[PDB]
Amino acid sequence: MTWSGQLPPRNYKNPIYSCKVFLGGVPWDITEAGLVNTFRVFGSLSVEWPGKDGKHPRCPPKGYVYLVFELEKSVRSLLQACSHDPLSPDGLSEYYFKMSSRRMRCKEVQVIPWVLADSNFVRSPSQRLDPSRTVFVGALHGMLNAEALAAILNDLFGGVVYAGIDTDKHKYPIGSGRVTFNNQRSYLKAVSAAFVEIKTTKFTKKVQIDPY
């Protein structure tokens, strides 16, 4: 099946944070521990980039880095002590900050952290995960947040109780999950549909499903 009926995938509730944050905008930063010594001013912080076991730590990506630290307080602190804009970018939400000091160049960096609204959603918080009544989800959008996951799963059958995407320790998969139901209508219809398409004007995606 296919439609254009999506719910705004850019108007989520931003409750709290639960996984790492993606960062980029530093095409000249020689050492990522510099960014750590400018951000750890607010608390416990750490950093990760591929290749810290290489020939020197001055070999981080051409302009990218990832951050991992205190799951909640430091996360909201950075985002709420720097610059933010809602939907004025005219396409998505974004955060920005600036750690330059006319030492050689000056440019701002752009942040997008992992929110609990990217990990799961419920149609009823007063319910639970039912005994072995859940099917696998994959090949979905590289975010497929709780607004898009709630839109596709209520449109297909309206019989839902819980849905989410699986995470591991700081691997930021956002691409493999499961969905739980309290009705049978969702089990044989999700398996018979196996794939549906989003055909909006400036946003198009698909989500796949497999039996349990």
UniProtKB/Swiss-Prot annotation:
Swiss-Prot/TrEMBL site (Important for the positionning of RRM1 relative to RRM2) positions: W114
Domain RRM: 19-111, 133-212
Region spans: Necessary for stress granule assembly and correct localization in dcp1 bodies: 38-212
Tissues in which the protein is found: Isoform 1 is expressed in immature oocytes, ovary, brain and heart. Isoform 2 is expressed in brain and heart. Isoform 3 and isoform 4 are expressed in brain. Expressed in breast tumors and several tumor cell lines.
Subcellular localization, as worded in the UniProt entry: Cytoplasm; Nucleus; Cytoplasm, P-body; Cytoplasmic granule
PTM note: Phosphorylated on serine/threonine residues by AURKA within positions 166 and 197. Phosphorylation increases binding to RNA.
Organism superkingdom: Eukaryota
Role: Sequence-specific RNA-binding protein that regulates mRNA cytoplasmic polyadenylation and translation initiation during oocyte maturation, early development and at postsynapse sites of neurons. Binds to the cytoplasmic polyadenylation element (CPE), an uridine-rich sequence element (consensus sequence 5'-UUUUUAU-3') within the mRNA 3'-UTR. RNA binding results in a clear conformational change analogous to the Venus fly trap mechanism.
Subunit structure: Interacts with kinesin, dynein, APLP1, APLP2, TENT2/GLD2 and APP. Both phosphorylated and non phosphorylated forms interact with APLP1. Interacts with TENT4B; the interaction is required for TENT4B-mediated translational control.
Domain notes: The 2 RRM domains and the C-terminal region mediate interaction with CPE-containing RNA. The interdomain linker (411-429) acts as a hinge to fix the relative orientation of the 2 RRMs. The ZZ domain (509-566) coordinates 2 Zn ions and is probably implicated in mediating interactions with other proteins in addition to increasing the affinity of the RRMs for the CPEs. A continuous hydrophobic interface is formed between the 2 RRMs.
Family stated for the protein in its record: Belongs to the RRM CPEB family.
Protein name: Cytoplasmic polyadenylation element-binding protein 1
Phylogenetic classification of the source organism: Eukaryota, Metazoa, Chordata, Craniata, Vertebrata
